[PDB]
Amino acid sequence: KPILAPEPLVMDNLDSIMEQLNTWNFPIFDLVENIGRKCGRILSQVSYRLFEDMGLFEAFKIPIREFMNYFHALEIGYRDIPYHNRIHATDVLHAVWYLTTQPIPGLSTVIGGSYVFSKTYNDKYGCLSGNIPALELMALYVAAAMHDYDHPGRTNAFLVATSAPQAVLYNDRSVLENHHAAAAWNLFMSRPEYNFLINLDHVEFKHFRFLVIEAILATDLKKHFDFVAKFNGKVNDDVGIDWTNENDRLLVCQMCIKLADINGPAKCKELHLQWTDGIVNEFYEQGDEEASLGLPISPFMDRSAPQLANLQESFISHIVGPLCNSYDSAGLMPGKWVERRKIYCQITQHLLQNHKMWKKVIEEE
Amino acid sequence: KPILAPEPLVMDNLDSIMEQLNTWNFPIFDLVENIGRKCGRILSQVSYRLFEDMGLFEAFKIPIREFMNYFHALEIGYRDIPYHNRIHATDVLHAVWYLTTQPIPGLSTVSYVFSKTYNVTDDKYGCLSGNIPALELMALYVAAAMHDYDHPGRTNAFLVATSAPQAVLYNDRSVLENHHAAAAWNLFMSRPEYNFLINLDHVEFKHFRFLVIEAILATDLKKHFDFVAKFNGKVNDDVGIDWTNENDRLLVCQMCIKLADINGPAKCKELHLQWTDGIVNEFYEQGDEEASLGLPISPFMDRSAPQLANLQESFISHIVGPLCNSYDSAGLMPGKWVRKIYCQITQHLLQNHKMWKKVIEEE
Ligand SMILES: [C][C]N([C][C])C1=[C][C]=C(C2=N[N]C(=O)[C][C]2[C])[C]=C1N([O])=O
Ligand SMILES: [C][C]N([C][C])C1=[C][C]=C(C2=N[N]C(=O)[C][C]2[C])[C]=C1N([O])=O
Ligand SMILES: [Mg+2]
Ligand SMILES: [Mg+2]
Ligand SMILES: [Mn+2]
Ligand SMILES: [Mn+2]
């Protein structure tokens, strides 16, 4: 049972691709090809680099062996399925790191907590890492790594409709997300070889665990409109986001992991088209099982009647679009001032270009 | 491998106690003595009587063997602990049946079932069973029977503080209540011998399961103040409770199971004192394990320094009192026109509260 990290913990021949981590369109499929498909090390190698970039090993006296042991066991428990795999976990962790470390035009630093900064971070700009304490940031990064742990390649709706043992176990409520959090935490506690949090006190550890669970459970898209309405409520109230309020910080971390989780349509066309391929291939596996069980095939999941452009157009218009508008309205989107100044925002620019590409595909069909 | 209901499905020797089900202070400990203390049939025998009283077997074409098979398997998986046992499950089912079937002064009433006990044909009474469709009522009754299934005799706080497997499995959220619902439903789906819902269509069955889970999860007292504030909100808004609104009906069913679950302090002194003895004895078992694990003993859980009166006074003042006041303000409390209203349930709660305050005054 004690899966341990490969002998040379840090792989070391990957420097030329790893130095591109500080870009939004990090070429993650070129990293996969450089490491080796199913070498099972992409998540632990990127986790190492981003924890070191933030000085999180010093801040919490994290021993590197136990940390690499855990992140390797975690990445090994992600299945070989087309989308909800360790490559997606790596992508989401990169996205949360990018959203929390990169310059945000006109964001104020909380006047007055222990805070970490990226080595990449060097009046007119702030970053979330300057407003969210190191403990809470580390919880968000670990949540991103564990968020899809042991994903079966089926939706909550499918597990509930088929009375899958997991759906009965979790009373049909956030079935996958409860399982990811519970299975990742059970893995963590199963062996002292995994205990990278040994230097947190008991109060800190219980708070850390609470924050990780809240972040993973926030990735259930059945709650998507509830989180977005709650967040628009906090932004448009008397004081706006209050960075000294622990519940306001939690809600920002949850919006951050939610955006990170569905970042694909807001990447360059090349990345977005590869992730689109991944999710529709996982849907077709589900559509095949639905047919074999005599259920009707869910919309967009029938390989012999694809509606790929309709899926991505409506995903962008109903889910990704409103989440980005809400996050941008809070003033939390990384961007650059244009030389009542305007902001150039790469993330919304990509989402707009991808939306237009899918509408153009629809108008031909 | 399947637990099956005992030889003659219905015990014939219980008639003189079973006819007293239509009283608030049902002598449940006399029923225990008449059956035998761990005979393990009390929940299935009472469930049969209350389902037959409401004509629920005819309304959903329930096969009685599968129904008795399931309720016997369920009652067997309640542990021999002092409070959260099959006797408590029986008590809560009786209380939800009583609150939903018995006359309510000035309640308006319209796929509905009615108790054979419901006589009193004065215009000026209704019952909730006249306002809550039979499918939703049956969900509330089955939830009451399953609400504490496989209870370990420990609080959520103890399971979370000790990183018990169940607390890890449920991410520290409503750990016991998720387990009761999940373990009860797993038992149901485990055997065709248990499928008493076979004549519900697929839409009905999915709705039924949703309602049962919502009712069991509502018994977590971490949510108590949220439910009470939400209910007072719906009662004091422009239209009040709207019986044609499915979310208003669910919230009434959840207030009903919540009151049924903590009914003890609103029973006659004799019943209330036996239930109080049960809960403090279960707490002491928890305090013993806390000491052995080197944890500080939780408040009220120390056998060598009991604080029974302080426990019950503050439980009634903080939890039971405000829930009864809120349910009574909605006009949903069973009672009799004297015209003012005599309400047995609130009169018992007031008398038991005064009894504990008087005990404290000596200590
Ligand atoms: C129903 C939402 N959903 C299932 C979990 C989903 C997940 C991810 C993506 C997805 N689409 N485009 C990408 O670039 C990659 C991911 C974010 C799309 C959907 N969807 O059903 O539409
Ligand atoms: C606070 C909730 N609780 C422990 C889970 C509890 C349950 C039942 C009773 C109990 N009190 N009085 C009775 O008559 C029987 C039951 C409801 C009391 C408590 N409590 O901690 O106060
Ligand atoms: Mg997920
Ligand atoms: Mg309970
Ligand atoms: Mn994900
Ligand atoms: Mn109970």
Query: In units of Å, what resolution does this entry have?
Result: 2.0
- What's the rounded Cα separation, in Å, for the pair A83 and A39? 17
> May I ask the CATH class of domain B14-362?
mainly alpha
Annotation says A84 is catalytic: yes
CATH of domain A14-364: 1.10.1300.10
Contact at CB, B171 and A185, closer than 8 angstroms: yes
Count interface pairs A-B at CB distance under 8 A. Answer: 41
User: What are the extents of the domains in chain B?
Assistant: 14-362
Beta-strand (E) ranges in chain B?
104-105, 125-126, 336-337, 341-342
Which residue's alpha carbon is at the smallest distance from atom 14 of ligand 1?
A264
Tell me which amino acid residue B315 is. Answer: F
Q: Evaluate: CB of A88 within 6 angstroms of ligand 1.
A: no
Contact at CB, A182 and B163, closer than 8 angstroms: no
A202 is in an annotated binding site: no
Name the residue among B49, B35, B27, B28 with its Cα closest to residue B6. Answer: B35
Q: Which two tokens stand for residue A44?
A: 């632990």
Catalytic residue among B84, B151, B179, B180: B84
Q: How far is the CA of A153 from the centre of ligand 3 (A)?
A: 10
B156 CB burial (10 A radius; 0-12, 13-18, 19+) = buried
Q: Evaluate: CB of A160 within 6 angstroms of ligand 1.
A: no
Count of C-beta atoms within a 10 Å radius of residue B279:
19
Q: How far is the CA of A267 from the centre of ligand 1 (A)?
A: 13
> What approach was used to elucidate this structure?
X-ray
Q: Evaluate: CB of A17 within 6 angstroms of ligand 1.
A: no
Which residue's alpha carbon is at the smallest distance from atom 9 of ligand 2?
B279
In sequence order, what are the residues at sequence separation of 6 or more whose Cβ sits closer than 8 angstroms to the Cβ of residue B336?
A: B103, B105, B342
Q: Long-range contacts for B307-311 (Cβ within 8 Å, ≥24 apart)?
A: B308/B276, B308/B280, B309/B356, B309/B359, B309/B360, B309/B363, B310/B360, B311/B280
Please say whether the beta carbons of B240 and B234 come within 8 A.
Answer: yes
Please say whether the beta carbons of A272 and A349 come within 8 A.
Answer: no
Name the residue among A123, A14, A38 with its Cα closest to residue A86. Answer: A38
Backbone angles phi, psi at A106, to 5 degrees: 65, 15
Backbone angles phi, psi at A105, to 5 degrees: -60, 130
Q: Evaluate: CB of A82 within 6 angstroms of ligand 1.
A: no
A104, β-bridge pairs:
A126
- Partner-chain residue, chosen from B169, B171, B213, that has the shortest CB–CB distance to A171: B213
Give the best residue of B171, B179, B186, B187 to mutate against chain A (max A CB count within 10 A). Answer: B171
Chain A contacts to B (CB-CB under 8 A): 163, 165, 168-173, 178, 181-182, 185-186, 189, 209-210, 213, 217
- Partner-chain residue, chosen from B172, B186, B217, that has the shortest CB–CB distance to A168: B186
**B9: DSSP letter:** S
